[PDB]
Symmetry: D2
């Protein structure tokens, strides 16, 4: 009896198959990278606007400079003379709850609040009372004084193409409240993509409510940022190889050593 099960790709036959679509049909149907992601991650032929939204998400998350945790770590590996994969992975491993990997939790938290019937102000006050950070809100450098154009682009697309945007609308109401409290509490790219994907999955017509919930629960949304930002991290690796930057060592003047005494 077979010990493994697989559903997404069959490479055994005359032609490669992605989720029951032979590769020739993938190209004949002009499915693009977004359509291939729809097949491999969601086992569906998603609508064109959904495929294009996926591609837009990969484009807008591609890079955000060398200062962020993962790009900084990739740059260090590259400067340590490591190979592409080691350097990329060293940076990818920083993606999580604080940096880049709040899409899953933003989708879950905003969907829960919305579906439960609580209004935006009740959601904000409940999270504050419980000491819970709102996932998908907040940014170290972008703010109401320095808005995030990636969020604007995504919003504009969703409004032009999506048949329904109730969760995005709810999250934008939350953002009006949080930014009035502190200017950095914007709806960040993780929050935008997360809530937009809930609206997309629930209303595109390719999924049942249970199927959409399963995709959010198993972590598909965070994958969008991982795949998108991998392009920028590889770009930083290549750039540092071209720049011929030597081994980095962090300066002692930026480190406070406070070791135990009387040992």
């Amino acid at each position: 009896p077979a010990s493994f099960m697989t559903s997404i790709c069959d490479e055994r036959g005359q032609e490669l198959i992605y989720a029951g679509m032979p590769i020739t049909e993938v190209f004949k149907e002009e499915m693009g990278i977004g359509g291939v992601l729809g097949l491999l991650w969601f086992q569906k032929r998603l609508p064109k606007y959904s495929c294009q939204f996926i591609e837009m998400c990969l484009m807008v998350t591609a890079d955000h400079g060398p200062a962020v945790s993962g790009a900084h770590n990739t740059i260090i590996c590259a400067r340590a003379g490591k190979d592409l994969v080691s350097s990329l992975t060293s940076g990818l491993l920083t993606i999580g709850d604080r940096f880049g990997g709040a899409l899953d939790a933003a989708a879950k938290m905003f969907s829960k609040a919305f579906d439960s019937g609580i209004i935006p102000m009740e959601f904000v006050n409940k999270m504050k009372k419980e000491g819970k950070l709102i996932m998908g809100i907040g940014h170290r450098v972008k703010s109401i004084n320095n808005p995030d154009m990636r969020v604007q682009i995504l919003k504009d697309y969703v409004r032009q193409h999506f048949p329904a945007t109730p969760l995005l609308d709810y999250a934008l109401e939350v953002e009006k409240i949080t930014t009035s409290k502190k200017p950095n509490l914007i709806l960040n790219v993780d929050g935008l993509i997360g809530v937009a994907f809930v609206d997309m999955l629930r209303n595109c017509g390719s999924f049942t409510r249970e199927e959409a919930d399963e995709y959010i629960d198993i972590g598909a949304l965070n994958g969008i940022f991982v795949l998108g930002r991998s392009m920028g991290f590889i770009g930083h690796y290549l750039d540092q190889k071209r720049l011929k930057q030597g081994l980095y060592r962090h300066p002692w003047d930026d480190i406070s050593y406070v070791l135990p005494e009387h040992m």
Copy 2:
């Protein structure tokens, strides 16, 4: 004090994000796509549209090749071990670079070295057979002339229809005519096609000098293409094992030979 880091690809400090000198709104207004964003971030060039589309086609054809290959299998094992997406993806990516996923790069370098040495295809084939070296990017387990690899056919047709010049692909196709005459399954395979066509894009699209094209190949651009493309399939395998509720795996002892010292 002087800056310790240098960067050339992206500037997020302003009001509007910039990728290699193009503000993010312009990237979208010019319909650059994923391939154009790659050209900006990896090469700091605005590539022609046909080159951007070829890059996307490469990412589509390399997206996945089933669960049995080294990296997909390692990602599946992590997923079955209850790990998170990034850990599982990275466990599989870490298998890439030599015997798995390294042939795009190896084929681009080998064919480029032969072409740049000024030797003709027959001299190249004979030099490799004398040196007991396999030609990288040549050979398939079952495909042959008149039974093509469809991934090769699709990409090759696009490249020949859109690229102004394809001298390295032309050379590789001349090598294929010779190797297939020796053994019919010695076709130009998908690694060979992508490798040589990617070199032809860098050398002939007009955005690079030869020094820049050769440098991007040397520092690993084709390793990047395989990694970025295949990451999509590996994430897919992670999600699939969770969808299929697959539990912890432990390899059976009946498929392991234990030969410890006496």
Copy 3:
């Protein structure tokens, strides 16, 4: 500009290296060993000799458990793909977690909470079984009451002979009597044994307050013991695959059920 980083464990700025307030020469003069260095670097404490020796025993008993387990299997595949030592080690380490090798933190937390709350062993088990929650540190795929784990025996024997008190181990063993009477594979596994024995060590060695001991459990120190110990074996498997001249692995299709959508 104020310092952006804070650190407490090692100072390499002076002529002589310092580990947690001790110059490296003093570490060797005091014969601290690997276990004593771990006490300094992970806990910033001087530990009794039996605690240091227990730590070393844990690292020795977790060093390896064959090539079939998730992480060793992944390391081997990665070595067979021609990759380097660190990539291959890390591909295997990334499988460590809730199902394989990384149940020490959760076992320590769940047994400590039950023990501290005064719940008797049967009430803890029945609760967990009624709730469908797995008891972390219980269960094994191949070891059982019919095939006992000698690593557990060795650890138990040491802890009972050398520790001043073993209340959490004693509680966990009462739980194991109950779970193994239900199903023979529901043994106290190495993750459970080390997890509870470390709680007993931290709480009763005299180097920690209860609050300090609870914090190190909370932040995840205990899983580190298995990661550090098993890294020796995974490096061993990497070297073994090179010494055995093992080639590229591909999982056999006969062991995979392809159920794609129609």
Copy 4:
């Protein structure tokens, strides 16, 4: 035919075995961590002085502060709220030719020079003429004026306990020359451990010259630093969490953005 082959550990029986030794015998013989490493990596019961040297190497490489590439990367992951393994791995992935991973190359380069009969001065000149860095030489902060006590501790042990140290003696002659040229060109911890392991493996009696050279070739020596430094990287992970350190973002003033116009 079996799809996997293995020779280091057999867990199929009632009692676990490491390279032919049942786990109870490992403890009965007081083999320690160093002895277990001898079994799992070298398939040998090594002499006690070799086992103790292995343990000393793991102790001296355990940590070297938070500024080095790998510790820094681990710290960044920890500050990004990641788990232990992800954070450790992010730092281990920096180990290589420049940082922590020059033991294999130092052993190879020094062994091939020594065996070739070339004297230390002519080896230094030959590498300089060929534009090749001497692996195992050099350090960013340790120098003639800021010596490395780890190297001193290791040297003292090797001189007191090893039966023969010809490669270490040769490397120390190379160091005298390179440090006269530039103060940073010390024999670093990678070079010391690499060359000492060649002396250990060739002269402990457990290996033939062929077996000893194969170990250098497959890359066992780099594993000593990886295994040792993993303790320090885990220590940094724990430390950042205990210190409740938040998400890090590098300051823009320390980055020169030079994009195309």
